[PDB]
């Protein structure tokens, strides 16, 4: 990015020998049947297939329809479950999926707290709030995952859960 | 490779002395008469004749027109009723015998990985997946054998094989 790749999606596991036209027709028909289209006409403008590596890139007419179409992840097309993803180049804007982690033992250092979070996936940002004059923990931290799909996995696996004699709070910071 | 047999048909009970060009003219004429063509021009691209055993193969320009010509089973040519069938190696579900190969050492290149595979027989398709930014192997590959009946002999031979430091996964890609 920062503003790049907003109107394309990766589609993996496409059926063998399928055409660009046929894939286009399929996605345009689903957008309509599922009520995800936001104006009259076709949301998908073009499809590019790599037949050797069995994947496609769809290009959409709008930003919001690209986002809506991700709800089709897993849809079966000619026997095949399609893998729908953002382009590698796509990044959300900074602080969009920042997490607050509260209810931590205050005797734990930074690497020890990071350990629990990186079990779900890699981090692109982390800070453990400390009393700068003494250096000691305040019992809470902030972080952001490299993969934004992991955010809800960390919340689901850590929020409301027992850690020592204290219960964690894990939620979006804003 | 796989769809190659999706564009041909076996023809039996052919009349004595018939040429490849004569067979070609008859089938093109029949397809145009029935309106079974998808475009202008001639659907049959080539015919091969075995005159000793009285059969031919026809090759078509498309998968859909091949399926259509199947409706000519029993049609009369030079007083004789022709038998039209699929090749014995026709794949009705295409891509069914495509294999995934996982757990490869990441230093191995395309030719080294094929060498492991071609001990069981000739391949029709192969690709090793690489990171496009560095050109470095991601450690998995895909393939298909020319003879699909070798597929399960390769899975039996290769699946779970300790390959240096790693253990191979070899299965149908799905």
Q: What's the 3-state SS for chain A?
A: CCCCCCCEEEEECCCCCCCHHHHHHHHHHHHHHCCCCCCCCCCEEEEEEECCCCEEEEEECCHHHHHHHHHHCCCEECCEECEEECCCCCCCCCCCCCEEEECCCCCCCHHHHHHHHCCCCCEEEEEEEEECCCCEEEEEEEEEECCCCHHHHHHHHHCCCEECCEECEEEECC
Q: What are the tokens at B132?
A: 């496009």
> A89 near A7, Cβ under 8 Å?
no
The whole-angstrom separation of Cα B171 and Cα B143 is 10
CA distances, A36 to each of B28, B61, B90 (Å): 45, 38, 39
The whole-angstrom separation of Cα B156 and Cα A41 is 51
> A14 near A80, Cβ under 8 Å?
yes
The whole-angstrom separation of Cα B44 and Cα B28 is 6
Angle between helices B110-117 and B151-158 (to 10 degrees): 110
B81 pairs with which residues across the strands? B76
Q: Does B94 touch chain A (CB under 8 A)?
A: yes
The whole-angstrom separation of Cα A45 and Cα A23 is 11
Q: What are the tokens at A25?
A: 């027709």
CA distances, A66 to each of A44, A45, A86, A150, B123 (Å): 9, 11, 9, 20, 39
Considering only CA atoms, which of B58, B60, B78, B88 is closest in space to residue B17? B78
* B3 closest CB neighbour out of A17, A79, A80: A17
Residue partners of A108: CB distance under 8 A and separation at least 6: A137
> A154 near A99, Cβ under 8 Å?
yes
Considering only CA atoms, which of A26, A45, A22, A23 is closest in space to residue A34? A26
A89: exposed, middle or buried (Cβ count in 10 Å: 0-12, 13-18, 19+): exposed
Cis upstream peptide for A2 (omega within 30°): yes
* B127 closest CB neighbour out of A15, A17, A53: A53
Residue A94: phi, psi to the nearest 5? -45, 130
- Are residues B2 and A15, on separate chains, in Cβ contact within 8 Å? no
Token match 């599922």: residue? A34
Domains of chain B: 1-92+149-174 (3.30.70.330), 93-148 (3.30.70.330)
> A171 near A100, Cβ under 8 Å?
yes
Considering only CA atoms, which of A126, A99, A104 is closest in space to residue A114? A126
Q: Does A88 touch chain B (CB under 8 A)?
A: no
> A103 near A168, Cβ under 8 Å?
yes
> A146 near A124, Cβ under 8 Å?
yes
What single string gives the DSSP state of each residue in B64-108?
HHHHHHGGGTT-EETTEE-EEE--TT--SSTTTT-EEEES--TT-
A55 min Cα distance to partner chain B (Å): 13
Q: What are the tokens at A153?
A: 């996995």
Helix (H/G/I), strand (E/B), else coil: B8: strand
CA distances, B157 to each of A55, B72, B126, B168, B173 (Å): 29, 43, 18, 11, 17
Q: Does B38 touch chain A (CB under 8 A)?
A: no
Considering only CA atoms, which of A140, A143, A102 is closest in space to residue A121? A143
Contacts of B95 in chain A (CB under 8 A): 15-17
Token match 């729908």: residue? A84
> A70 near A84, Cβ under 8 Å?
yes
A11: exposed, middle or buried (Cβ count in 10 Å: 0-12, 13-18, 19+): buried
Residue partners of A93: CB distance under 8 A and separation at least 6: A2
CA angle A123, A148, A99 (to 5 degrees): 65
| Stated resolution in angstroms | 2.2
Considering only CA atoms, which of A95, A150, A85 is closest in space to residue A117? A150
The whole-angstrom separation of Cα B145 and Cα B126 is 9
Rg (CA), chain A: 21
Q: Does A17 touch chain B (CB under 8 A)?
A: yes
Considering only CA atoms, which of A47, A91, A86 is closest in space to residue A69? A86
Considering only CA atoms, which of B127, B5, B69, B147 is closest in space to residue A53? B127
> A25 near A114, Cβ under 8 Å?
no
Experimental technique of record? X-ray
Which residues of chain B from 112 to 151 reach within 8 Å of chain A, CB to CB?
A: 127, 129, 142
The whole-angstrom separation of Cα B151 and Cα B159 is 12
* A17 closest CB neighbour out of B94, B127, B174: B94
């Amino acid at each position: 990015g920062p503003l790049g790749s907003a109107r394309r999606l990766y589609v993996g596991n496409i059926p063998f020998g399928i055409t660009e036209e046929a894939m286009m027709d399929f996605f345009n028909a689903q957008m309509r049947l599922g009520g995800l289209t936001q104006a009259p006409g076709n949301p998908v403008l073009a499809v590019q297939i790599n037949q050797d590596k069995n994947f496609a890139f769809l290009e959409f007419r709008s930003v919001d329809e690209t986002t809506q179409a991700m709800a089709f992840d897993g849809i079966i097309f000619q026997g095949q479950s399609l893998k729908i993803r953002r382009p590698h180049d796509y990044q959300p804007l900074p602080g969009a999926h920042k997490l607050f982690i509260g209810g931590l033992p205050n005797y734990l250092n930074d690497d020890q707290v990071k350990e629990l979070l990186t079990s779900f996936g890699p981090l692109k940002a982390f800070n453990l709030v400390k009393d700068s004059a003494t250096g000691l923990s305040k019992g809470y931290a902030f972080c952001e995952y490299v993969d934004i799909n992991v955010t809800d996995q960390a919340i689901a696996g850590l929020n409301g859960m027992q850690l020592g004699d204290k219960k964690l709070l894990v939620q979006r910071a804003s």
